[PDB]
Amino acid sequence: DKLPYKVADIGLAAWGRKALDIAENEMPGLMRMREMYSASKPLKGARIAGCLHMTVETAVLIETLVALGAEVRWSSCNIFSTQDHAAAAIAKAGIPVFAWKGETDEEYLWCIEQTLHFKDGPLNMILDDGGDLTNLIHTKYPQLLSGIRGISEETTTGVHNLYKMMSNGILKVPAINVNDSVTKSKFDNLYGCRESLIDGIKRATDVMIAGKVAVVAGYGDVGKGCAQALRGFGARVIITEIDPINALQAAMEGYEVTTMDEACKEGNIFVTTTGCVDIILGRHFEQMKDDAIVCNIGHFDVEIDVKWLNENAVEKVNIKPQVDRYWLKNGRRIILLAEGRLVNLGCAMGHPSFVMSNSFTNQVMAQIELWTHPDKYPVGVHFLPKKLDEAVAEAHLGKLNVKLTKLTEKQAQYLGMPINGPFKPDHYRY
Amino acid sequence: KLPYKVADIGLAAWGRKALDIAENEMPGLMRMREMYSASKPLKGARIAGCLHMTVETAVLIETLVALGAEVRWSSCNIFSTQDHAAAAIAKAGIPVFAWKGETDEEYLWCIEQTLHFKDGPLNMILDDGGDLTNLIHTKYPQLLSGIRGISEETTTGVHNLYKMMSNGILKVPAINVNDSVTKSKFDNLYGCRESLIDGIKRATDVMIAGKVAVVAGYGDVGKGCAQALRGFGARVIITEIDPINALQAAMEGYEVTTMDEACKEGNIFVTTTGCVDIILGRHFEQMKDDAIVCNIGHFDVEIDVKWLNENAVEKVNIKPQVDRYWLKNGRRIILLAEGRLVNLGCAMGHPSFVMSNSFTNQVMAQIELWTHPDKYPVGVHFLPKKLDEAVAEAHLGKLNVKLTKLTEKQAQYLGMPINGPFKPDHYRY
Amino acid sequence: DKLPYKVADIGLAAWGRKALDIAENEMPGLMRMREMYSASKPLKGARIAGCLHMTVETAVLIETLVALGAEVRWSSCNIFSTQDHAAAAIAKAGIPVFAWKGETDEEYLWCIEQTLHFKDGPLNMILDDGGDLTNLIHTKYPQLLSGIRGISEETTTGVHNLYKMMSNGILKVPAINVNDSVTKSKFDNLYGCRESLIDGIKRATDVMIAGKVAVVAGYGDVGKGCAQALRGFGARVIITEIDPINALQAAMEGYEVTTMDEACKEGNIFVTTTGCVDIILGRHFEQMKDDAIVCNIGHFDVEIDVKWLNENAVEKVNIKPQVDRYWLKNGRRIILLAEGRLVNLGCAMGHPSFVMSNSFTNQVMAQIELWTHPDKYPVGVHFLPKKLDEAVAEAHLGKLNVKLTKLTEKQAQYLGMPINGPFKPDHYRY
Amino acid sequence: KLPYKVADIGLAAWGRKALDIAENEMPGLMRMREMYSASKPLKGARIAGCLHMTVETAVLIETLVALGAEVRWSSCNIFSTQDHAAAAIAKAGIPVFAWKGETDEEYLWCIEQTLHFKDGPLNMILDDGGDLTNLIHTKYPQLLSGIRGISEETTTGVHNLYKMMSNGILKVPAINVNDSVTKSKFDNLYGCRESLIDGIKRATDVMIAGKVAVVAGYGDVGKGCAQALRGFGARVIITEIDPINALQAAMEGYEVTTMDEACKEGNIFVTTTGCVDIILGRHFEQMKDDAIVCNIGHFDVEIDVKWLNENAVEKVNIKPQVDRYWLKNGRRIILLAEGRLVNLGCAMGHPSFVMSNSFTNQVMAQIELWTHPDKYPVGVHFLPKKLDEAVAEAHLGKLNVKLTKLTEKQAQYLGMPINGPFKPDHYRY
Ligand SMILES: NC(=O)c1ccc[n+]([C@@H]2O[C@H](COP(=O)([O-])OP(=O)(O)OC[C@H]3O[C@@H](n4cnc5c(N)ncnc54)[C@H](O)[C@@H]3O)[C@@H](O)[C@H]2O)c1
Ligand SMILES: NC(=O)c1ccc[n+]([C@@H]2O[C@H](COP(=O)([O-])OP(=O)(O)OC[C@H]3O[C@@H](n4cnc5c(N)ncnc54)[C@H](O)[C@@H]3O)[C@@H](O)[C@H]2O)c1
Ligand SMILES: NC(=O)c1ccc[n+]([C@@H]2O[C@H](COP(=O)([O-])OP(=O)(O)OC[C@H]3O[C@@H](n4cnc5c(N)ncnc54)[C@H](O)[C@@H]3O)[C@@H](O)[C@H]2O)c1
Ligand SMILES: NC(=O)c1ccc[n+]([C@@H]2O[C@H](COP(=O)([O-])OP(=O)(O)OC[C@H]3O[C@@H](n4cnc5c(N)ncnc54)[C@H](O)[C@@H]3O)[C@@H](O)[C@H]2O)c1
Ligand SMILES: Nc1ncnc2c1ncn2[C@@H]1C[C@H](CO)C(=O)[C@H]1O
Ligand SMILES: Nc1ncnc2c1ncn2[C@@H]1C[C@H](CO)C(=O)[C@H]1O
Ligand SMILES: Nc1ncnc2c1ncn2[C@@H]1C[C@H](CO)C(=O)[C@H]1O
Ligand SMILES: Nc1ncnc2c1ncn2[C@@H]1C[C@H](CO)C(=O)[C@H]1O
Ligand code: NA
Ligand code: NA
Ligand code: NA
Ligand code: NA
């Protein structure tokens, strides 16, 4: 009585499959998980509802979970991030996916709702990115919580929410924080954004980066990646920050660190990375250089006051999908990307597949941990063990032709560690 | 006569919006309009243009028109046209014969459409790579005495001009635009530094970080390519024939070796040489699985694409301008744009700001040749340094640069005109 | 009956004082500690034995501890690292310092021994860098342990030893791990080495960096700094690593990662950063390019087999102090810096003062924590609270003209944090 | 006659060990020895050299001697001599008159000691900045007809040569060594990229990261300086008079503004212009406390040091070549080397490898002028590109670079001699 899937055009499946084949060959961590666990099927019995950007890389993740024995139903965690060819390939393979590029808010919620019920029963695992699925179940379907064995969560904003839920006694299911695996936060958030931020800006606007002033709000792992990208192409990068440690890191790297109240007068490009509300406001827009480009890469579209532009501009000219040029009362123009939604996935294709193999190999490990060892994980928010984190990295070395040194027994004795690791104390920051 | 031929005139409104955006990024061209729209220095000029029909080129076209020229236009590559830009130019009433994905026959037909105007044949050439110049000299020599001048955009095209002059076969005066400082040291360098990666990413979405990337040639193009790749975390290996360029690359921290060795290590290959026979069958056979191979030189002569078509066991089209070959050895090769320049073939070419440097030089060269032909005997000439400096100066305001002015005491100390030119003729910047 | 101090030449004091005045003005964190606590004198009653490189920066630290009420007696923790003008200035101010550049191993131990006994009694606090003082007291003077209120420890090797001591039940005094303050490990070890490694190499050898292959063993915080420095000047940098996560970081930054067994055939410059034994051995030396430069920046001189060179070379030619050129049986030459001791302090002046103000402001905070709040700190190894770590960074922002953004009450509510911080969870890696 | 005059002959053994090390880093010079020591092309040459008396220059001196020249030497700066290198040269029996920390009178006396050899006056000039050239022309014109040639090392010196020729006052042929590609694009750029920081660090030990650094000029020197500072985490602000250089700096991500503005923000100031009156009293009065101020241009004319001496309320010598001034406003200024070039005055100048490029050009220019005077009429000349390429090629082996060779088919395609030169005369690299 329900749709078996819902995608833009199932006819795109053959093209999606070609993109998947190429991506598989860039994702050795995921392929290794298939190779190790396809026969034993550790995820047999798992009914995973996933809510995560329905991209080519997410399709390789989905097929890994399926190869490992899971039943899966999927939606995207952003209205603009789905790659319709990837979604079509997943649907063609018989996997229930409810996702397309350019959903409305209503369609978005409907899609998540389709993932909750399997033939054998409701979901018993959650794989989430940003917390929308986690929150939906806790608030709207609390009756389903005792049936769920575990949650794994992809991103900084989502894990922040899990910590908040736990400290408020609202969290009712064990969760693993995948964002804060070393091999996720220090790779995907950093090197991922270093490539895909500029990709979104370029595909949207074709603007020259060299010669511009770029303003990056936040200097966490995402802001660090974005700043490096922009400066690499010859932009002069200004940073805003609230945290004196991150601010001091930026200044030590040669960036001017000042407030948005000042930087708004100088920036030609504005990128928000904070995960926080009220970063770019009407008072900033009114002071910006003509044709300033403004975009957000944080998870939710809460950083930029897009409502201000819609209410106060003389006119809004749509240039092409996800690219709007507003004409203000001061006669100047602002170019706004993706209506303030995360620009790398909304205007380009998100992070390339190789780095997503780090993040998603963590996801598969988390799902195996929660599903097969539920009693290691009481209701709470947990990290994967360092030995598994190290294993994720080690799985990607051969593709890059890296040769890792092995400690001799004498060196391992001297350092007081096992020759097979883990090699760092739990507080190590890399 | 056909007013134009383009893929889809319906793309005109979008094209125009992209032109509006690009105008605001092209202060040199907008300045040429503000200075010369009234006096119309190019009145009576009938310019045939053969140059990648992009948004940037559209802004150049409408600048030439504003300055009084009649213009008829074709692209200098079968894959580089941006159909929305060609539609905007067609809708404006300018004869343009260009679309993305031309056949070789269509390519020549389009150039041929640019030769004849209502009032006579062309009397000015604006060229990129020399196809229009060569076509006239070889096939339409009866039009040569009617042509006042040629201006040439690119390294490969200027090499051809110098060779023609040395052999006594050039018959029309030319200005080498490529070797204006504000072209060669900006467009070829900073332009490729952004548009090479754009082409590779739009085509393949591949991660750059952690890869080995092999860049053949370390000229102005290869310098920009190499910096771009290294910036994203590729380990870049350079090949070179010139010991000076090779020493530059080594002093910037790049491994310099031959393609014969580098083919065994690269995950990404980019040819920047302007030379034939750079990546051959013997190289393809040694490459890592799913090696991405592409060219950014003007002509598609650097990569043996014919070898792949003849020797691969499978050839799968992934999407337009992206082919995945399976070789007898079991490994795969990803070839971009059939070896044609990848930035314009798989993306949008250089962004507008830097093209404003190149194209302001083009406008100046067209004015120089059209209005001061006697300064330019048959031969190959540079624009004066004062004009080259003026191109850079016109772009400083947009970037909020504050230029220092010499005092009279400092100008006297330096033995320099206070208003420039500031460097000797041999200065390399 | 004992020397009041022992330095190379007390006559250098006036020049030392001029260097100190300049350094003070680059060390706003330490000067702020003086300004805040000079009147209340929180360290009144403290008798601090310090064992830490007797440099210009350490002199500003010492005078801060004294201004805060402490009695101090000092030695260097390396035989080659003392700056004789700094030592002379300290001695001239009436502070017992036992340190000079170029001590023998015997003199080194004698110097530490002079710091143990004060007029009023034995030491009751330890400030250490590498653990030599901590170990000396636990092994040779166990009778003094119950009189010691606390230990603060500067460096990675020293903190590793403290963790080992604690897990073996050998640690008898509470300790604070200053190395792993964010504002120490992610600044001093990284940005400090990024400047002072090249300084030591240049002053020793004047070698051109551009065009060379440089091999860096280890890609921790020190190796990251060293690699960046070398590549910035046009060296091609190869990295060795045992930890697959650090190895993957290096490869993602564009370095070749391979083993020393391979890299030894290619390197023109070799820098060891591991903190581990047996990094460069005779088998590597015999394969090195002619005039390969070999140096160590790790704390102890255990990385390079200098004994191999001394036993196997045809001859050793001293070029100048801390620079030796060995002629091997293969006819090639090796240039060895500082006899394998840490090259930044041995051949140049160590880290510049601004970054040392981060490290040493942590040291002063640790000493205040341990001395005035002993019951917060049971026998064990502890970190400073994140709020104090943030304060260290904030203290350095004004000197760099950084403008830090303040959260609004609405943003702080949204992020669920205090407007005054701390701004990050305890696991945050920066 | 005095055999030499140096600070301390006792430093000879150490000097020699430093020379031994530098020889192994200078394959171009060692190659000139291996090729020409037997044939002695410079037999009969009596070369007066005026050039920073460093370890690198010692290797140049002994190369000229190996090639048959007689040489007598002085430094071109009062603070740049390396006394151990001067001692090694003196101990070898070569007349050198140089020490670190000369007075102005001693400086001139030393140059005067180089004019007369046992067999006659000088017949060749090797100059850096033009002091020897100018001294001969103005004070010893009777020696001019006896001088076969001049070779000149540096930008400021070549500017003077061109000005002299334009005014008809140059009377001896000269080779512009600075503008060999392998000099200007290597020494001025990569040399300063390492030796500027060396000078600042040895003098002050200041942290670079987190500072604002102001670099006046973005020529080859300022480009290398700016990269060096940015690499260590300084935020670099550029000043410029030339709109081309200024646009380059902006396209590399540097703020470009005037010294009038930048003096309010910089923590470190470096002058690279070759021009008078760059940092004035009005700038000093606005600077941040403990601003470090230094010059790397040839002559000490860029910084108003006299202003500081006259207007400061206190002047404290921190150590040799380092002065801390206290101004009326309460703030301090740290001045390096009394405004003299800071890399050679406070450190060791450029490392040996890159100097091997510069100095191989010098040897070639001395051979060209001495053995082929008829190729060089009175005027200012470049070395042929084939010789410039040969300089780079001689340094490739040391760095294990593998240079590709064109095939006959590629050379024919490019219209290029298979063995070079590979670039046209106007190529800018
Ligand atoms: N689009 C993507 O592919 C992608 C990838 C990874 C993470 N993310 C998202 O990016 C966002 C940031 O992630 P992160 O890992 O960098 O988190 P982070 O905590 O490491 O960094 C955020 C930084 O913003 C700063 N900040 C907070 N409020 C600010 C304000 N008002 N002004 C200036 N700075 C302020 C904080 O001090 C912090 O350092 C999150 O929403 C995360 O979920 C997106
Ligand atoms: N795609 C674009 O947007 C764009 C932009 C500018 C120029 N171009 C084209 O790019 C090409 C290069 O232009 P350039 O300005 O860099 O020229 P260049 O002459 O500056 O550099 C080319 C380099 O290739 C080297 N080379 C020649 N043959 C080689 C071989 N067999 N192997 C290795 N190296 C070899 C040469 O020594 C030279 O240094 C030309 O075809 C030019 O027209 C393209
Ligand atoms: N000279 C200085 O100014 C200075 C400053 C700070 C720290 N240190 C010292 O530097 C050393 C390193 O400090 P750190 O903070 O970088 O520690 P770290 O733990 O962050 O890094 C050391 C790295 O070496 C790697 N390693 C260990 N054995 C290895 C081997 N056999 N081969 C290759 N890699 C190996 C580890 O995986 C690790 O990543 C320590 O001795 C520390 O005390 C010196
Ligand atoms: N210290 C060294 O080891 C060393 C090495 C090479 C050259 N030099 C000397 O360095 C100086 C610069 O050499 P170069 O090769 O870079 O010359 P250059 O001509 O390439 O660059 C100097 C730049 O200064 C700019 N300039 C001139 N006046 C200015 C002003 N008032 N304000 C701002 N910018 C101004 C010019 O536009 C030019 O771009 C010369 O004196 C040269 O002899 C020193
Ligand atoms: N190609 C991609 N496919 C799927 N997820 C991606 C992609 N690129 C980035 N991400 C997610 C986006 C998210 C913020 O919601 C993160 O933390 C990243 O892991
Ligand atoms: N966007 C663009 N529009 C038009 N021309 C472009 C663009 N980008 C690059 N070029 C040309 C390509 C050509 C080699 O044929 C050159 O030399 C560059 O100037
Ligand atoms: N100038 C300096 N004065 C004092 N200590 C310094 C200096 N530079 C670096 N350090 C210490 C050296 C040590 C390894 O023993 C560390 O961890 C750094 O904090
Ligand atoms: N080590 C060095 N030995 C000798 N000459 C040096 C050194 N470093 C730089 N130079 C000169 C300085 C000069 C400006 O006077 C130049 O143009 C550089 O070639
Ligand atoms: Na992808
Ligand atoms: Na464009
Ligand atoms: Na210091
Ligand atoms: Na030297």
**Placement of tokens 């060749």 in the chain:** D124
Residues B75-90: b if buried by 16+ CB within 10 A, e if exposed: bbbbbbbbbbbbbbbb
SS3 content of chain A, % helix, strand, coil (to 5): 45, 15, 40
Among candidate residues B420, B367, B349, the one with its CA nearest the CA of residue B53: B349
Q: Which ligand is nearest to the CA of C59?
A: 7
C-alpha torsion C407→C410→C412→C413, nearest 10:
180
Within 8 A by CB and 6+ apart from A35, the residues are none
Which residue, C53, C60, C56, is CA-closest to C75? C53
In 3D space, the residue among B349, B387, B357 whose CA is nearest the CA of residue B27 turns out to be B357
Label residue A297 left, alpha or beta by phi (over 0 means left) and psi (-120 to 50 means alpha). Answer: alpha
Q: Contact, D98 vs D20, CB < 8 A?
A: no
Return the structure tokens found at A25. 């060959």
**Largest interatomic CA distance in chain D:** 73
Over the range D393-429, which residues count as b (16 or more CB within 10 Å of their CB) and which as e? bbbbebbebbbbebeeebbeebebeeebbbbeeebeb
Tell me if B345 CB under 6 Å of ligand 6: no
Nearest-angstrom CA–CA distance, B301 and B304 = 7
Residue of chain C whose Cα is closest to the Cα of B247: C211
Is there a contact between D207 and C56 if contact means CB atoms under 8 Å apart? no
Contact list in D for residue C355 (CB cut-off 8 A) is 207, 209
Q: Is C301 on the interface with D (CB under 8 A)?
A: no
Which of A317, A342, A321, A88 is CA-nearest to residue A199? A342
Query: How long a stretch of residues is chain C?
Result: 430
Counting as contact any 3 or more CB pairs under 8 A, the partners of A are B, C, D
Six token digits for residue D425: 């005369």
Of D190, D402, D423, the CB nearest to B256: D402
D406 CB near ligand 4 (under 6 Å): no
Q: Does the C-beta of B129 come closer than 6 Å to ligand 6?
A: yes
User: Residue A150: what residue type?
Assistant: G
- Give B409's contacts in chain D (Cβ within 8 Å): 276-277
Could you tell me if A182 and A397 are in contact, meaning their C-beta atoms sit under 8 angstroms apart? Answer: no
A217 lines ligand 1 (CB under 6 A): yes
H helix or E strand, kind and range, residue A344: helix A343-347
The SS3 call for residue A37 is helix
- Ion ligand 10 — residues with CB under 5 Å? A 206; B 55, 348, 352
D412 Cβ partners below 8 Å, 6+ apart? none
Q: Nearest-CA distance from A145 to chain C in Å? A: 25
Nearest in space to A414 (alpha carbons), one of B22, C161, C424, C191: C161
**Cα of C342 to ligand 7 centre, how many Å?**
10
CA of C231 to the centre of ligand 7 (A): 23
Q: Write out residues 313-372 of C within 8 Å (CB-CB) of D.
A: 317, 319-320, 325, 333, 335, 348-349, 351-355
A18 contacts in B (CB within 8 Å)? 316, 318-319, 324
Strand order in the sheet with B149-152: B96-97, B70-74, B46-50, B124-127, B149-152, B174-176, B380-381
Q: Which of C207, C209, C236 best probes binding to B when mutated, by most B CB atoms within 10 angstroms? A: C236
Q: What tokens were used for C189?
A: 């070890």
Ligand at shortest distance from the CA of A298: 1
The contacts of residue A214 (CB under 8 Å, 6+ apart) are: A227, A230, A231, A235, A236, A237, A238, A267, A268, A269, A270, A271
Ligand number nearest to the C-alpha of A22: 9
- Whether a cis peptide bond, with omega within 30° of 0, leads into A422 is yes
Is residue C267 within 8 A of residue C213, CB to CB? The reply is: yes
Q: Which of A160, A376, A345, B226 is nearest to C427 (CA)?
A: A160
D204 Cα to the center of ligand 4, angstroms: 24
Does residue B182's CB lie within 6 angstroms of at least one atom of ligand 6? no
What single letter denotes the amino acid at residue D1? K
SS3 per residue for B304-363 = CHHHHHHHCCEEEEEECCEEEEECCCCCEEEEEHHHCEHHHHHCCCCCHHHHHHHHHHHH
Residues β-bridged to residue A334: A292, A326
Question: Is the Cβ pair D242, B420 closer than 8 Å?
Answer: yes
CA atoms of B85 and D116, how far apart (whole Å): 74
Nearest-angstrom CA–CA distance, C110 and D351? 40
Window C:239-278, CB contacts with B under 8 Å: 248, 251-256
How far apart are the CA of D201 and the centre of ligand 12, in A?
A: 16
Catalytic residue numbers of C read 53, 76, 81, 129, 154, 179, 184, 188-189, 193, 299, 351, 359, 363
What does the block give as tokens for C119? 């007029």
For A270, the token pair is 């504005």
What 3 state SS string does chain C have?
Answer: CCCCCECCCHHHHHHHHHHHHHHHCCCHHHHHHHHHHCCCCCCCCCEEEEECCCCHHHHHHHHHHHHCCCEEEEECCCCCCCCHHHHHHHHHCCCCEECCCCCCHHHHHHHHHHCCEECCEECCEEEECCCHHHHHHHHHCHHHHHHCCEEEECCHHHHHHHHHHHHCCCCCCCEEECCCCHHHHCCHHHHHHHHHHHHHHHHHHCCCCCCCEEEEECCCHHHHHHHHHHHHCCCEEEEECCCHHHHHHHHHCCCEECCHHHHCCCCCEEEECCCCCCCECHHHHCCCCCCEEEEECCCCCCCECHHHHHHHCCEEEEEECCEEEEECCCCCEEEEEHHHCEHHHHHCCCCCHHHHHHHHHHHHHHHHHHHHCHHHCCCCEECCCHHHHHHHHHCCCHHHCCCCCCCCHHHHHHHCCCCCCCCCCCCCCC
CB A297 within 8 A of CB A269: no
Does residue B95 contact residue B72 with C-beta atoms inside 8 Å?
Answer: yes
Residue D311 and residue D321: Cα distance in Å, rounded? 19
Rounded CA separation D28/D191 (Å) = 16
Amino acid sitting at position C106 = E
Please give the method by which this entry was determined: X-ray
Residue (of C244, C164, C226, C238) closest to C189 by Cα position: C226
Give the closest residue to A151 by CA, choosing from A41, A52, A30: A52
Contact assignment for D233 to A210 by CB distance below 8 Å = no
**CB nearest to B251's CB, from C210, C237, C256:** C210
Neighbouring-strand partners of residue C335: C293, C325
Q: Who among C231, C235, C254 is closest to B234 (CB)?
A: C254
Radius of gyration, CA atoms only, chain C: 22
Active site residue A81: yes
Instruction: Give how far Cα A318 sits from Cα of B14, B18, B419, Å.
Output: 9, 11, 44
Asked if the Cβ–Cβ distance from B194 to A211 is below 8 Å, we say no
Give the distance (Å) from ligand 9 centre to CA of residue C46: 61
Q: Which residue has the tokens 């593998």?
A: D402
Which structure tokens are listed for B366?
A: 């067209």
- In this structure, the number of other CB atoms found within 10 A of the CB of residue A311 comes to 9
Nearest CA in chain A to C396: A248
Residues B140, B115 contacting (CB under 8 angstroms): yes
Does the N-terminal peptide bond of residue C422 adopt cis geometry, omega within 30 degrees of 0? yes
Q: Which chain B residues are Cβ-neighbours of C269 within 8 angstroms?
A: none
Question: How far away, in angstroms, is D128 Cα from ligand 8 center?
Answer: 8
Measure the CA–CA gap between A155 and A152, rounded to whole angstroms: 10
Residue partners of A155: CB distance under 8 A and separation at least 6:
A129, A130, A179, A299
Retrieve residue D371's tokens.
């053995």
Which residues are CB-contacts of A129 (< 8 A; sequence separation ≥ 6)? A51, A52, A53, A77, A153, A154, A155, A158, A299
Alpha-carbon span C8 to C31, nearest angstrom: 28
- CA geometry: angle A360, A364, A367, nearest 5 deg: 135
Burial class (CB in 10 A: 0-12, 13-18, 19+), A393: buried
Helix H, strand E, coil C: the string for chain D is: CCCCECCCHHHHHHHHHHHHHHHCCCHHHHHHHHHHCCCCCCCCCEEEEECCCCHHHHHHHHHHHHCCCEEEEECCCCCCCCHHHHHHHHHCCCCEECCCCCCHHHHHHHHHHCCEECCEECCEEEECCCHHHHHHHHHCHHHHHHCCEEEECCHHHHHHHHHHHHCCCCCCCEEECCCCHHHHCCHHHHHHHHHHHHHHHHHHCCCCCCCEEEEECCCHHHHHHHHHHHHCCCEEEEECCCHHHHHHHHHCCCEECCHHHHCCCCCEEEECCCCCCCECHHHHCCCCCCEEEEECCCCCCCECHHHHHHHCCEEEEEECCEEEEECCCCCEEEEEHHHCEHHHHHCCCCCHHHHHHHHHHHHHHHHHHHHCHHHCCCCEECCCHHHHHHHHHHHHCCCCCCCCCCCHHHHHHHCCCCCCCCCCCCCCC
- At A389, the amino acid letter reads D
Run of H or E including B364: helix B352-371
Q: Choose, out of D252, D254, D267, D268, the residue to mutate when testing the contact with A (most A CBs < 10 Å).
A: D252
Is residue B64 classed as helix, strand or coil in its secondary structure? helix
Question: What are the structure tokens assigned to D121, written together?
Answer: 């006056």
Cα–Cα distance between C181 and C358 in angstroms, integer?
10
Asked if residues D244 and B182 have their Cβ atoms less than 8 Å apart, the reply is: yes
Expressed in angstroms and rounded, the spacing between residue D54 Cα and the centre of ligand 12 is 7
B318 chain-A contacts, CB cut-off 8 A: 15, 18-19, 22
Q: Give the whole-angstrom CA distance, residue D36 versus residue A170.
A: 86
Distance CA C309, CA C427 (A): 44
Q: Are the Cβ atoms of C194 and D210 closer than 8 angstroms?
A: no
Annotation says B188 is catalytic: yes
Residue D220 labelled as part of a binding site: no
Q: Which residues are near ligand 7 (CB < 6 Å)?
A: C 53, 55, 57-58, 129-130, 154-155, 188, 192, 299, 345, 350-351, 356, 359
Q: Mapping DSSP to helix (H, G, I), strand (E, B) and coil, where does residue B71 land?
A: strand
Nearest CA in chain C to B265: C256
Nearest to C110 by CA among C222, C259, C214, C6: C6
Euclidean distance between CA atoms B177 and B360, whole angstroms:
10
A292: how many CB neighbours lie within 10 A of its CB? 24
Are D149 and D124 spatial neighbours (Cβ–Cβ below 8 Å)? Answer: yes
Sign of CA dihedral A199, A201, A204, A208: negative
Task: Name which of C236, C237, C253 is nearest B233 (Cβ-Cβ).
Answer: C253
Cis peptide before A378 (omega within 30 of 0): no
Residue B229: which of B280, B277, B179, B296 has the closest Cα?
B296
Alpha-carbon distance values, D212 to A232, A252, B266, D158, D203 (Å): 19, 11, 39, 32, 18
Delineate the domains of chain B, giving CATH numbers in brackets.
1-189+350-401 (3.40.50.1480), 190-349 (3.40.50.720)
Comparing alpha-carbon positions, the chain C residue that sits nearest to D212 is C400
3-state secondary structure of A252: helix
Q: Which amino acid is at B89?
A: I
Contacts of residue D374, Cβ cutoff 8 Å, sequence gap at least 6: none
Contact between B21 and A291 under an 8 Å Cβ cutoff? The reply is yes
Q: Which ligand is nearest to the CA of C52?
A: 7
Q: CB–CB of A88/A8 below 8 Å?
A: yes
Q: Is A140 helix (H, G, I), strand (E, B) or coil?
A: helix
C-alpha angle C41-C45-C47 in degrees, rounded to nearest 5: 110
For CA atoms D63, D64, D67, D68, the dihedral sign is negative
Distance CA B115, CA D314 (A): 77
Count CB neighbours of B168 within 10 A. Answer: 8
- Catalytic, B361? Answer no
D290 inside 8 A of chain C by CB: yes
Q: CA–CA separation, C57 vs C30, rounded Å?
A: 10
Residue A189 DSSP one-character state = I
Q: How far apart are CA A303 and CA A218, in angstroms?
A: 11
Q: Which residue of B has its CA nearest to D253?
A: B399
Is C25 an interface residue toward D (CB < 8 Å)? Answer: yes
Residue B128 appears among annotated catalytic residues: yes
Resolution, given in Å to one decimal, reads 1.5
C-beta of residue B56 within 8 angstroms of C-beta of residue B81:
no
- Active-site amino acid positions of D: 52, 75, 80, 128, 153, 178, 183, 187-188, 192, 298, 350, 358, 362
As given in the structure block, the two tokens for residue C247 are 């190895």
